[PDB]
Design a protein around this ligand. Structure first.
Ligand code: NAG
Ligand code: MAN
Ligand code: MAN
Ligand code: FUC
Lengths: 48, 319, 192, 145, 48, 287
């Protein structure tokens, strides 16, 4: 099985803002899958 | 064996930029030069910081370049004065068509389609003598001269037309440098040994006996065959001479030469040599080359070997 | 023909079909050169732009003469694009700048080639400057051979005399006009 | 191929040399230069801690990628085996310039010192110059204005 | 790879069916009418 | 090696305030580049805010004595109704001319088969070609023609090309390298006994063989081939220097949209579309 995340959490508050992702059903380890990932497992930015 | 055979990379060095030259009116620029302290070679970092600079600049004199009146020669719309004979020529001697654009019945266009001499525009390129490569299109070697003179390559060939920049061309077939060199090295070894041995010994009543023996045979070899073949052929299918006088310069060359400032500028007149090259072919072998090096190595090794050994040790006792 | 591996030596079928195709599109294999700046006759200010263009070729050579390249391996001629040197190779030498040899070519070792001129030695006591070059790219050591073309130059110590003030426009045909017809003369006045 | 070519070998001029017959072209030429210099300052592979096994880095936008050598693979080119002749060791490669020193006598300076894992195992020294010095920008500020 | 396309950066001339949904978008914000433009005409335009 | 996630720098100090847009852009350059399978910097390499400029928007200027196309590029009046498309994209020089006023510019319309690639831009650091920079086909009302000795055809050349040559070269290099190996081996041993004893009546007897054998084989083979080959059909194609190159309409539009104040974000947009360099000369051929 090849991995992909759930939908990412929309944002946290302003003054520094964060988005987060999980693979709970999706994950490779069941029946010995392939790559889990293609980008950043967590994400954050300035508000402006 | 060799490794890093290719020699140590010289990285480029350039001097400090000079002054901004006396500001050139007609180009409306001033040029800042720099020189080379060592070129790049064997793969070193190029002169990647660009080798020349131009600054936009206010003039400080009028431009003094003339217009050409050219004594009844025909001024084409891009400014070339072609020969008066070519007015209403037919074909197109200006490139611009200005020679023919509005006319009555033209002068005689040739009695047929004729192809030009093969690769003939190479005879009209320039050569950068410092860099060992072509530059420019110095002559328009598709200029027809308003005439239908022709050369035949073979009975099987179509006829070919001579552009007016060439004093003569010959078709031939030649080999003019011819080289075949070949080497063979062959080496064989055959080695072997084979052997046998035997022996036996002997010595209440008590008695003892012994026997032993051996055998071997072996054969081995190495072989090498390595062979080389270099063939270099220089073949000279065309030979040519470009005229001594009145050569027809290419549109794109005749443009740049007019554009150059009348007052000197090192960078502006220098780009003519990057663009058009340093020298042109007055005569030359429009030929073919084949160069071929075939190197071969073959090497081989073999073995066979056999052995046996035996021993026996016996005793009797009685009373 | 270029695809042919060559183990047989030349396959005359392919070599002849290629050679017939060479009649149909050649390449320049050897050549005899005249300098670009001799050509030009059409342009306005021809003579002036010509003078300047010789003069630029002198400076261009002083800057880009491949004598300044490090010694070429295996007796190639050094050649310089402007920003990199590459060596032009001899038959039996190859690689990017001639670093390696066919097994026959190793026998030559003749090795006769120049390094750059020194700057000008100032006037020789008959007012002529001069300069010399020293055969000093990788020297004629194991074999022996002269570098080609005269080792030294002599050049009159010429310099400028007058306030520079730009340049005049000059064209080849004009100067021999000892006589020309009386002008349209609209400022009527009188002739002599 | 004679009827459908591609470009095979190239000699280059910097793009900024083209800017002509637009408003402020005089200035735009220098600004496209400084922007190209700054583009190169983003893009130069010096930002990338070098690929192993002779692979050359390149900058993706805000990111590094590797042009690996054949049948050696992965993001750093660590996995697999090379093919063809090999020199051994690790040939040296630069980390990015220390940002230009303030002007003296009309010239800046900058220094790069091969601070990534050094030329090692007999590998050749980093290909380039440790230090550069360049004339300052004050002629744009005074003249083009 | 026997053609390469690049679209101009701007000064573009629109297909009239797109242009007419764009002239039908509200200046007020309410996501559903804007959603139909992405359904009918895509999220991004192909530039190279 | 450990995966490197990207890090943003702190922002630059905005910009000179843009006279046309009435905005300012601040750069967010890179402190650490992502490497080794680690993340690129999430979000935007720039941001932009409104700003009241002391800077003017530059006006933009037409052609005077020269004709003007719909884009704003300028072209000689001697190229109006020349019947070529002299205006690069919109051919306003060919709008509503009379067939009595029209004339032939040349016998043919066909260029050398990919002259287009000669006018492309070039990104040195990705190594790739970039979009149309030089107009490769400003014929310029001229009938500069060449017979190609390869593909056997006549072609038309532009005044933008310094030289289109029609030389051929093909250079081939082959390396083929081969190994093969094989082995076989045998070993044997035996160790043996007998004894017999009789006493008076009673007797006993015995015998033995320990015996053993081993063999092995191996083989290994490898074969490695390289070919590199080049073809050319024009070998110096030379583009002119910038004094005589005529530019592509959208590239020249971008040069007009470039802000004339130093917005780094604005100047990147040309560099990403058109690269770092133009091809000044080269070989058009094959590999
Ligand atoms: C050209 O080579 C031929 C041999 O093909 C020779 O006969 C001819 O005179 C040479 N042409 C000239 C005049 O260079
Ligand atoms: C949520 O946020 C980013 C936006 O930058 C998405 O692209 C991604 O799906 C992440 O999980
Ligand atoms: C960004 O902010 C800096 C603060 O130093 C200003 O100097 C600059 O004008 C820009 O607005
Ligand atoms: C510096 C270069 O790389 C290696 C060194 O052993 C040599 O000095 C060579 O010139």
């Amino acid at each position: 099985i090849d991995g992909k995340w759930n939908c990412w959490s929309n944002w946290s508050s302003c003054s520094g803002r964060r988005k987060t992702r999980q693979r709970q059903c999706n994950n490779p380890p069941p029946q010995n899958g392939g790559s889990p990932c293609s980008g950043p497992a967590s994400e954050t930015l300035d508000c402006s | 064996r060799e490794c890093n055979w290719q020699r140590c990379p010289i990285n480029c060095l350039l001097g400090d930029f000079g002054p901004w030259s006396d500001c050139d009116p007609c180009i409306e620029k001033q040029s800042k030069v720099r020189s080379v302290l060592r070129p790049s070679q064997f793969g070193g970092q190029p002169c990647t910081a660009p080798l020349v600079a131009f600054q936009p600049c206010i003039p400080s004199k009028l431009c003094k370049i003339e217009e050409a009146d050219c004594k009844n020669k025909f001024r084409c719309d891009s400014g070339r004065c072609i020969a008066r004979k070519l007015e209403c020529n037919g074909e197109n001697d200006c490139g611009d068509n200005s020679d023919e654009r509005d006319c009555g019945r033209t002068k005689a266009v040739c009695t047929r389609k004729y192809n030009p001499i093969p690769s003939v525009q190479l005879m009209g390129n320039g050569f950068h003598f410092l860099a060992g490569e072509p530059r420019g299109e110095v002559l328009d070697n598709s200029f027809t001269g308003g005439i239908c003179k022709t050369v035949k390559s073979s009975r099987t060939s179509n006829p070919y037309r001579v552009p007016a920049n060439l004093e003569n061309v010959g078709f031939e077939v030649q080999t003019a440098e011819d080289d075949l060199k070949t080497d063979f090295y062959k080496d064989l070894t055959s080695l072997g040994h084979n052997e046998n041995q035997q022996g036996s010994f002997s010595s209440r009543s008590e008695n003892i006996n012994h026997n032993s023996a051996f055998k071997q045979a072996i054969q081995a070899s190495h072989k090498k065959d390595s062979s080389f073949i270099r063939i270099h052929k220089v073949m000279k299918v065309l030979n040519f001479t470009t005229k001594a006088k009145d050569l027809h310069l290419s549109d794109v060359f005749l443009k740049a030469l007019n554009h150059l400032p009348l007052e000197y500028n090192s960078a502006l007149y220098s780009r003519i040599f990057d663009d058009f090259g340093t020298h042109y072919f007055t005569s030359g072998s429009l030929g073919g080359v084949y160069d071929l090096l075939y190197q071969f190595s073959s090497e081989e090794l073999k073995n066979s070997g056999l052995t046996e050994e035996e021993a026996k040790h016996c005793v009797r006792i009685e009373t | 023909l270029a695809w042919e591996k060559g183990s047989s030596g030349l396959e005359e079928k392919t070599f002849s079909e290629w050679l017939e195709s060479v009649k149909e599109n050649p390449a320049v294999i050897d050549f005899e050169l005249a300098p670009i700046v001799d050509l030009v006759r059409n342009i306005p200010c021809a003579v002036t732009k010509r003078n300047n263009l010789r003069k630029a070729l002198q400076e261009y050579a002083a800057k880009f003469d491949p004598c300044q390249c490090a010694p070429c391996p295996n007796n190639g001629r050094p050649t310089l694009s402007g920003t990199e040197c590459l060596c032009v190779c001899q038959s039996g030498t190859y690689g990017e700048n001639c670093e390696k040899q066919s097994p026959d070519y190793k026998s030559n070792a003749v090795d006769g080639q120049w390094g750059c001129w020194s700057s000008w030695s100032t006037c020789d006591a008959t007012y002529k400057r001069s300069r010399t070059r020293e055969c000093n790219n990788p020297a004629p050591q194991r074999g022996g051979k002269r570098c080609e073309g005269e080792k030294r130059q002599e050049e009159d110590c010429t310099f400028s005399i007058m306030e520079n003030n730009g340049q005049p426009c000059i064209n080849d045909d004009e100067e021999m006009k000892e006589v020309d017809l009386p002008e349209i003369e609209a400022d009527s006045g009188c002739p002599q | 191929v004679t009827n459908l070519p591609q470009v095979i070998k190239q000699k280059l001029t910097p793009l900024y040399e083209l800017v002509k017959e637009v408003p402020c072209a005089s200035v735009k030429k220098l600004y496209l230069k400084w922007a190209l210099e700054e583009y190169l300052d983003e893009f130069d592979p010096c930002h990338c801690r070098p690929c192993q096994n002779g692979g050359l880095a390149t900058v993706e936008g805000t990111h590094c990628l590797c042009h690996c050598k054949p049948y050696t693979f992965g993001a750093a080119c660590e996995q697999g085996v090379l093919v063809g002749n090999q020199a051994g060791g690790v040939d040296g490669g630069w980390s990015c310039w220390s940002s230009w020193s303030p002007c003296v006598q009309g010239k800046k300076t900058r220094s790069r010192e091969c601070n990534n894992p050094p030329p090692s195992g007999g590998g050749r020294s980093c290909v380039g110059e440790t230090t550069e010095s360049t004339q300052c920008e004050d002629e744009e500020l005074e003249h083009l204005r | 790879e026997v053609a390469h396309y690049k679209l101009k950066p701007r000064s573009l001339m629109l297909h009239y069916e797109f242009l007419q949904r764009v002239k039908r978008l509200p200046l007020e914000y309410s996501y559903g009418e804007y959603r139909d433009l992405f359904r009918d005409f895509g999220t991004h335009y192909i530039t190279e | 090696s450990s995966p490197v996630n990207c890090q943003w720098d702190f922002y630059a100090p905005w910009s000179e305030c843009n006279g046309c847009t009435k905005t300012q852009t601040r750069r967010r350059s890179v402190a650490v580049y992502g490497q080794y399978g680690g993340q690129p910097c999430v979000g935007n390499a720039f941001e932009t805010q409104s700003c009241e400029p002391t800077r003017g928007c530059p006006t933009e200027e037409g052609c005077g004595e020269r004709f003007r196309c719909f884009s704003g590029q300028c072209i000689s009046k001697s190229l109006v109704c020349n019947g070529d498309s002299d205006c690069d994209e919109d051919s306003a020089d060919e709008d509503r001319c009379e067939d009595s006023e029209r004339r032939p510019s040349c016998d043919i319309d066909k260029p050398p088969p990919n002259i287009e690639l000669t006018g492309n831009g070039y990104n040195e650091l990705t190594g790739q070609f970039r979009n149309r920079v030089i107009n490769t086909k400003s014929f310029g009302g001229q009938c500069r023609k060449v017979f190609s000795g390869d593909g056997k055809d006549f072609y038309r050349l532009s005044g933008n090309v310094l030289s289109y040559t029609f030389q051929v070269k093909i250079n081939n290099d082959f390396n083929y390298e081969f190994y093969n190996s094989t082995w076989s081996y045998v070993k044997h041993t035996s160790t043996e006994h007998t004894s017999s004893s009789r006493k008076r009546r009673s007797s006993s007897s015995s015998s033995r063989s320990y015996t053993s054998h081993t063999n092995e084989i191996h083989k290994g083979k490898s074969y490695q081939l390289l070919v590199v080959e080049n073809t050319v059909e024009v070998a110096q194609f030379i583009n002119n220097n910038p004094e005589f190159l005529q530019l592509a309409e959208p590239f020249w539009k971008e040069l007009s949209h470039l802000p004339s104040l130093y917005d780094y974000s604005a100047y990147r947009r040309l560099i990403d579309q058109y690269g770092t360099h133009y091809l000044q000369s080269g070989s058009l051929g094959g590999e």
